[PDB]
Write an enzyme that holds these catalytic residues in place. Sequence first.
Site: not given
Length: 279
Positions: A69, A161, A224
């Site tokens: 990530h 989200n 993100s």
Amino acid sequence: AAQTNAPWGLARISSTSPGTSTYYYDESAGQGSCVYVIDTGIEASHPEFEGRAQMVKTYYYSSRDGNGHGTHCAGTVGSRTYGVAKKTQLFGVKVLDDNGSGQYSTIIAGMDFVASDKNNRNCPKGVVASLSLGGGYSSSVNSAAARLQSSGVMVAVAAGNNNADARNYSPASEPSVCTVGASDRYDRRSSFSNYGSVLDIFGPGTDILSTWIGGSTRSISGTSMATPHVAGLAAYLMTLGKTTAASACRYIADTANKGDLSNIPFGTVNLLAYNNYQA
Ligand SMILES: [Ca+2]
Ligand SMILES: [Ca+2]
């Protein structure tokens, strides 16, 4: 400069319209700026970072990004092929574990770390922090983000989200930082993107190609992914001298594409990050 067949997000932030494929940008490319990526780490050895990335702090057993990530987000900030600011310096602060999770206490420490550590670094064009993370509302987390901003760092954070009002999420709900929602390649609000009065700006967030661990690449989606577009844009604009860490979020909002996005709830800004590059 022009990068042909760029990831759609890069093309989008250098166009007034959706559907283009070339990323147009000034060749200075964020040189002289620094972006801290506060996340799962950065695989600094990735050829895409060209030696411009380094880990500076970890809160776990290793500094290695065992998730991907953080490496993806760092790539969108400043990798050669996938980055907004292709010549910026990247600093990794690992506050998230290799499953992408982290305690608020650790995330706060990481923010406090960056506020101090920047004083040990040569960043003549300024300092940015990208926080592609968050959870439920916390005044302590918001305060940490406010401190980092106050210390002279351009803080960009994910809206979240949850397809909900970002007022109930942190550090998204901290007013003084730059809270970033996500859009897709057809200029729709991303299906998952939070919204609300606290959002400052939208960035590309659906199906974003960037770096991954093991020297690889992949496409993933999230606020993100939108956040590092805005962080990289800030670094880029700061290198150009158009704005400062204190004022960049406002500058980006000033100069954004206005009204281009669909499914924006009333009361949420309809603003999409745009570099206004004119060759
Ligand atoms: Ca337009
Ligand atoms: Ca704000």
